[PDB]
Structure formats: C-alpha cells, structure tokens
Amino acid sequence: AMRQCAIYGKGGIGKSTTTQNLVAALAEMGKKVMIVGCNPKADSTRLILHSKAQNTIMEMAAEAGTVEDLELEDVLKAGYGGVKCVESGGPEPGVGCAGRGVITAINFLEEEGAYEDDLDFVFYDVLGDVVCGGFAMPIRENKAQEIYIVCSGEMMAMYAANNISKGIVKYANSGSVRLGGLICNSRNTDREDELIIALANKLGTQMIHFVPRDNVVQRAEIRRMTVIEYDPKAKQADEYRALARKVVDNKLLVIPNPITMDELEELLMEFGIMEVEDESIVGKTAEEV
Amino acid sequence: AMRQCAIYGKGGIGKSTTTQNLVAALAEMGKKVMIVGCNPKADSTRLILHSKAQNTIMEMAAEAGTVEDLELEDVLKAGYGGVKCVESGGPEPGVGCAGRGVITAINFLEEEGAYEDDLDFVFYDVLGDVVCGGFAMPIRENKAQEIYIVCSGEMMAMYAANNISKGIVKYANSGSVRLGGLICNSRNTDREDELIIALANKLGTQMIHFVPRDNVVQRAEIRRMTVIEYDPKAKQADEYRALARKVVDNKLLVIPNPITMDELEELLMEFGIMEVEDESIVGKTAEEV
Ligand SMILES: Nc1ncnc2c1ncn2[C@@H]1O[C@H](COP(=O)(O)OP(=O)(O)O)[C@@H](O)[C@H]1O
Ligand SMILES: Nc1ncnc2c1ncn2[C@@H]1O[C@H](COP(=O)(O)OP(=O)(O)O)[C@@H](O)[C@H]1O
Ligand code: SF4
Ligand SMILES: [Mg+2]
Ligand SMILES: [Mg+2]
C-alpha cells in the first residue's frame, strides 16, 4: 500500500509547483495523496485548495494554546482530486527551529491517525537551501523513504541537490531513507538536461524527468490553480503526467554517492554554464590586464 | 570605537558581493574591518582573499579534533586593505544546526581576542532565507547591533527582509540589536527603487542605497576580486563608495515595524511587479474562462 515521499530542492526553482502539479496529476490517476508543507511560507498547498495561504499548525496552535486543542477538519483540508492538505508552519522568526514545526505536525497527523486512513501517497514539500537537522527532520525521523530532488543547471540548485544527498547518506544506516531521483526544472539555460543527467549518474540516481519552462504555469496560477486542473490538454500537463507516471513506476532507490566541489564544478564547465578559470589574470587589476 | 555589524538578506540577491565590496570600499577609506561568513558555503570571504574558498572552522576543527586546537593565523586570514577574514562553516549536512557553527567561531574569536585588537568594524554575512534561531544567533547573543538587510523588488527578498525584521523586534528588549537600513540590489525590474523605499518607510527604516546591476561585477569576479580592487574608477565602485560612506554616517537605528502579508502584497501590486487578483476566474478551468 502507501508510500512515504518527500520532495526536496532549492528555493525558487519551482519545488512547490512541480510538487503540487505532479500530485494533482497523480490524483488524476485517482490517488489519495496528502501534501504536507514544511516551509515557513504557506505557498506549498495553495494551488490545490484554490486558496491564497492555508492556515498553518504554528498559526492555529497559537490560537488554541497547544496542538492537542486542534481539531483535524480545520487543520488538514482537501482540494482538487480529494487531495488532503496541511501547511505546518515555520519557526517563530529569529527564535525557533524549523524542525519543531514539522515534527509537531507529523505527530498531530499520526495522533489523529490521518496517516493510516486511506492514502497511497504522502508528500512533504521541503526546502533544500539549508540542509541542517531542522529541514532534514523527515529523513531523521524516518518519515520519508523516497527523496525526490528538484534542481536545474545552476550551481546552487546542484549544490543543494548534493548536500541533500549527503543527508540521505548519513541516515542510510539508521533506516530506510533512500534517494529516488532528480527532477530537472528547466531554466531554459542551454544543455542543462544533459548536465543534470551527468549529476544524476555521478550520484548514482537518474534524472527521472525534465520539466520544461512553460507560461501555462503562471496562467493557471492567476486562478490559484494547478496546471492539471486549468488545461488538462496542454503538453505541460502531460509532462507532469509523464513524471507522475514515472514516479509510481520507479523502483530505483539508490543510496547516493556525493561529489566534490571540484567534481561538481567540472560538470558545470564541461557543460558550458560555468566558464573556465584563466589563472593568468587572478588577483590582477584593470591595468595589469 | 568599533561597530558590530551584520548584513542579512536572501540567497542569491547578492548579499556577499554587496558585503565584500562595501567592506573593500570601507577599507579604501582605511578601516580595519573583519568579515565573518556564517554561510554553509565558503563564498562569503573569497573575493577579498583572491581565493576560491577559504577554510572553515568546521573544516579545520574536524582536522585537529576540536576548536581549541586551532591556531588563529590559519583561521583568520587578511586580504585586500588588511581586511581580516573568517569563514565559519555550515552544519554537517542533514544533522547539525547552523547556529553552532557560528557560535563556536564567535567564541574562538573572542577567546583568541581578535575582537579587541584593532578593528573599527566587524561584519557578519548572514543568510536571510530561513530566519530561525540558528541564523539569528548574532542577534540572539547580542553580537550584531546593526542589521543591514539587502533586498530587491521581488516577493521572497522582501518577505525575508520583513521576517529578519521580526527577529530584531524580539531581541529589542533583551539587548541593543537594531535595524540599520535596507539596501536595494537592483534586479533591473522596473520601479523597484521606489518599492523598497516604500517598504523601508513602512518598516520605519530607510533604503540606505540603491546598488545597480553592473557587468563590472562579474568582470572583477573572474579574477576573484572585489570591484573596488579591479577598477577603482567605474561608477559601480562609487556606488559602493556611496554606500560605504552612508553606512558609517548612519545614526538611524530603528526598532522596526513589520507588516502583514496582505500589506506587503499591496506594495507589490501598487508598484506593478505583482499583478491584481481577478476573482472572477479563480478555481475555473480552460473552459469556464
Ligand atoms: N515549470 C515551470 N515553468 C515556469 N515557471 C515555473 C515552473 N515551475 C515553477 N515556476 C515558477 O517559479 C516561481 C517559484 O516556484 P515555486 O514552486 O514557488 O518555487 P519554490 O517552491 O522552489 O519556492 C513561480 O513563478 C513558479 O510559478
Ligand atoms: N550589484 C550587482 N550587480 C550584478 N550582479 C550582482 C550584483 N551583486 C551581486 N551580483 C551577482 O549575483 C550573484 C550572487 O551573488 P552573491 O553575492 O554570491 O549572493 P549571495 O551571497 O546572496 O548568495 C552573482 O552573479 C553575483 O556576482
Ligand atoms: S537546525 Fe536548521 S532550522 Fe533549526 S535552528 Fe538550526 S539552522 Fe534553523
Ligand atoms: Mg514553497
Ligand atoms: Mg555567499
């Protein structure tokens, strides 16, 4: 039955739009799936619920005093395709750890047993910028077995992908957390599809799909909607279908192999986004060259 | 004498390039300044030192076993303008808190007394994506009195700016941490200079300067250099001069006034980057409109 999935990736590469869409495309193949957003900002469940920003567990637990005083119907809410939704809340700015927000919401969902009710999939939307103990909480507490890293042909998204992968490495031994695959979200930078496959092979995983840059996306967004919900017929919808399909069919759950900075930098130079280091000119003024 | 400064801001808006440059332009007016990078990645001191990536305290303390076994000359290193430099190191991926890395490096710098040696300024390069207790460590432990938030006319950078501001609010009472001003780093999106000044006034601070988009920057970067060091004569160098000047002359250290999501969203719509919400179409398919 059920699979415990989590999607990681750097901020602003389109982690939530890939997640919400493939989950809507998964639930177009009639799956009860649940999205749990771990991100400070409530942007991780909004497109399914046609909402602006779902209420978070840190918001509502402030209102009722504690988490047990929260009643599930107004915590977890369903939208398109009966896809269940919970935005967990960030840290109290400058003071709390992000981890806490995530853990209390897992516990509230195991406690009021929405985890064992019928669901074929659970998905955690998790930021991969800092891969600290806090954001690695679903990995540490063995709540996410299948990590799907969203990225693109750009240094920082790759860095992120690799550093998320070092965290899978540490909890390989303690549990069953394993990397599924990378998902390349096109930046329209030149031969990025190739680059991310190179990385995927150097880590020992696959670049499970290449999601394109489409305007479709922001057309659907003005309506606070998923692409799958706005126009079922655009090939963007069938991209997310190809991924949503490829996701359930995957049986490659490697225990990845992280690379050096230098090794990563190779990839970037080799595929043209990063330039090549001419050492002649280093440390030399407008004059000296 | 000495001022304890920290520059916060979202990832990839150019927090480290603004910081390293204005610090090089501050040290062009002959100041002994020290940069301490708190970021996981060692990209926060590299342009001063003509290096690729300075060694971090978490890296070297792994080598010698503990922090006391570290000798200061190969921890803190100086580059252009006798500007002292220390990259503190990130969390061990998936396990550590970022906070720890920062705190051990403050303590090592107070312990081996580089804090009380001659310096007119100290600067902490700190990521503003997650404003959790970890990244708020120099604010919590009253090591940074003057927060300078770098941002731009874009939602997330603003969000960030505001949330960093909520953290200043919480430690207003306990200490002397106060917000200096915002710095707008041009994205070349249309009337962003105006937008960030609106925010600065709604927070009760000023948009201390508007740093432009220049190609100069990446020309200097191929040499692993600051703009101030590559061509002292470009008006980009005199922008950083205008900021480096404006920074020491500032005596506006407000205890900011954070805004609503809705209130922030106003700004964006009012200044044209965000659109306006037509509710007619919300939750309605390719067909229904
Ligand atoms: N495939 C895509 N094509 C075009 N824009 C996209 C695509 N996926 C996401 N985006 C856009 O990128 C921006 C950020 O997306 P988001 O999913 O919110 O990122 P994140 O989760 O990494 O913070 C928004 O404009 C989003 O609609
Ligand atoms: N004023 C500027 N004009 C143009 N590009 C800039 C400017 N400041 C920074 N950048 C560029 O933005 C990118 C990220 O800068 P960086 O300082 O490394 O960001 P960060 O510290 O927020 O991660 C690099 O191309 C950097 O050179
Ligand atoms: S573990 Fe990470 S989320 Fe928690 S306080 Fe540290 S840096 Fe923040
Ligand atoms: Mg999000
Ligand atoms: Mg940096």
B30: left (phi over 0), alpha (psi -120 to 50) or beta: left
Of B12, B96, B229, the CB nearest to A133: B96
User: Which residues, in sequence order, are bridge partners of residue A3?
Assistant: A121
**CA-CA distance, A132 to A284, in Å (whole number)?**
38
Question: Resolution (in Å) of the shown entry?
Answer: 2.8
CA atoms lying within 13 Å on the CB side of residue A215: 0
Question: β-pairing, A33-37 with B207-211?
Answer: unpaired
User: B133 Cβ partners below 8 Å, 6+ apart?
Assistant: A91, A94, A95, A96, A97, B99, B140
Q: What are phi and psi of A263, to 5 degrees?
A: -60, -30
- Unique residue bearing structure tokens 């003024």: A285
Coil vs helix vs strand at B282: coil
Residue of B nearest to A265 (CA): B52
CB-CB neighbors (< 8 A) of A139 in chain B: 94
Strand ranges in A168-288 using DSSP code E only, listed in sequence order: 178-185, 207-211
Are B35 and B176 in contact by the 8 Å Cβ rule? The answer is: no
Q: Which residues contact A68 (CB under 8 A, 6 or more apart)?
A: none
Give phi and psi for A207, each to the nearest 5: -90, 90
Nearest-angstrom CA–CA distance, A114 and B163: 32
Residue-wise over A160-179: b if at least 16 C-beta within 10 A, else e? bbbbbbbbbbbbeeeeebbb
Instruction: Look at the block and give the residue holding tokens 């800092």.
Output: A130
b/e code B123-149 from CB counts within 10 Å (16+ = b): bbbbbbbbbbbbbbbbbbbebbbbbbb
What are the structure tokens assigned to A133, written together?
């103990």
Q: What are phi and psi of A213, to 5 degrees?
A: -80, 110
Say if residues A136 and B94 touch (Cβ distance below 8 Å). yes
CATH for B1-289 (3.40.50.970, 3.90.650.10, 3.40.50.300, 3.20.20.60): 3.40.50.300
Q: Which is the closest atom of ligand 1 to the Cα of A185?
A: 1
Looking from the CA of A222 toward its CB, the CA atoms found within 13 Å total 13
Q: Is the dihedral of CA B148, B152, B158, B160 positive or negative?
A: negative
What is the spatial distance between Cα B258 and Cα B202, in angstroms, rounded to a whole number? 8
Per residue, the 3-state secondary structure of A27-93, as one string, reads: CCCCCCEEEEECCCCCCCCHHHHCCCCCCEHHHHHHHCCCHHHCCHHHCCEEEHHHEEEEECCCCCC
Handedness of CA B198, A219, A54, A116 (dihedral sign): negative
| Residue that the structure tokens 């990225």 belong to | A151
Give the phi and the psi of residue A227 in degrees, each rounded to 5. -65, -45
Residue A122, class by beta-carbon neighbours within 10 Å (0-12 exposed, 13-18 middle, 19+ buried)? buried
Please name the method used to determine this structure: X-ray
User: Is B44 labelled a binding residue?
Assistant: no
Q: Is B9 annotated in some ligand binding site?
A: yes
Distances (CA, A) of B232 to A285, B15, B32, B44, B81: 9, 21, 19, 21, 13
Three-state DSSP state, B208: strand
CA A101/CA A39 separation, integer angstroms: 9
Q: Has B41 been annotated as catalytic?
A: yes
Q: Tell me which H or E stretch contains A202.
A: helix A192-203
How near does any CA of chain B get to the CA of A199, in Å?
18
* Sequence letter at residue A88: S
List CB contacts of B232: < 8 A, sequence separation 6 or more. Answer: A286, B28
Q: Looking at CA atoms only, how far is residue B281 from chain A in angstroms? A: 6
What's the rounded Cα separation, in Å, for the pair B86 and B147?
19
Ion ligand 5: residues, CB < 5 A: B 16, 39, 43-44
> CA–CA separation, A38 vs A34, rounded Å?
13
Q: Which helix (H) or strand (E) holds A121?
A: strand A121-127
Question: Residue B233 CA to chain centroid, in angstroms?
Answer: 25
Helix axes A155-170, A261-270, angle to 10 degrees: 140
Token couple for B214? 């220049």
Could you tell me the strand order of the sheet in which B3-9 lies?
B77-79, B83-87, B33-37, B121-127, B3-9, B146-151, B178-185, B207-211
* Token pair listed for A263: 């090794």
User: A130 and B286 in contact by Cβ < 8 A?
Assistant: no
How far is B211 from B226, CA to CA, in rounded Å?
15
Q: How far apart are CA B175 and CA B144, in angstroms?
A: 10
Region at A14 (left for phi over 0; alpha for psi -120 to 50; beta for the rest): left
> Among A120, A129, A193, A238, which one carries the catalytic annotation?
A129
Helix, strand or coil, per DSSP, at residue B171: coil
Strand arrangement of the beta sheet that strand A83-87 belongs to: A77-79, A83-87, A33-37, A121-127, A3-9, A146-151, A178-185, A207-211
A84 vs A36: CA distance, rounded Å: 9
- How far is it, in rounded angstroms, from Cα B107 to Cα A51? 46
* Interstrand relation of A77-79 and A83-87 (parallel, antiparallel or unpaired): antiparallel
Pairing of strands B178-185, B207-211: parallel
Ligand 2 atom with least separation from CA of B13 = 22
Is residue A126 a contact partner of residue A36, using CB atoms and an 8 Å limit?
Answer: no
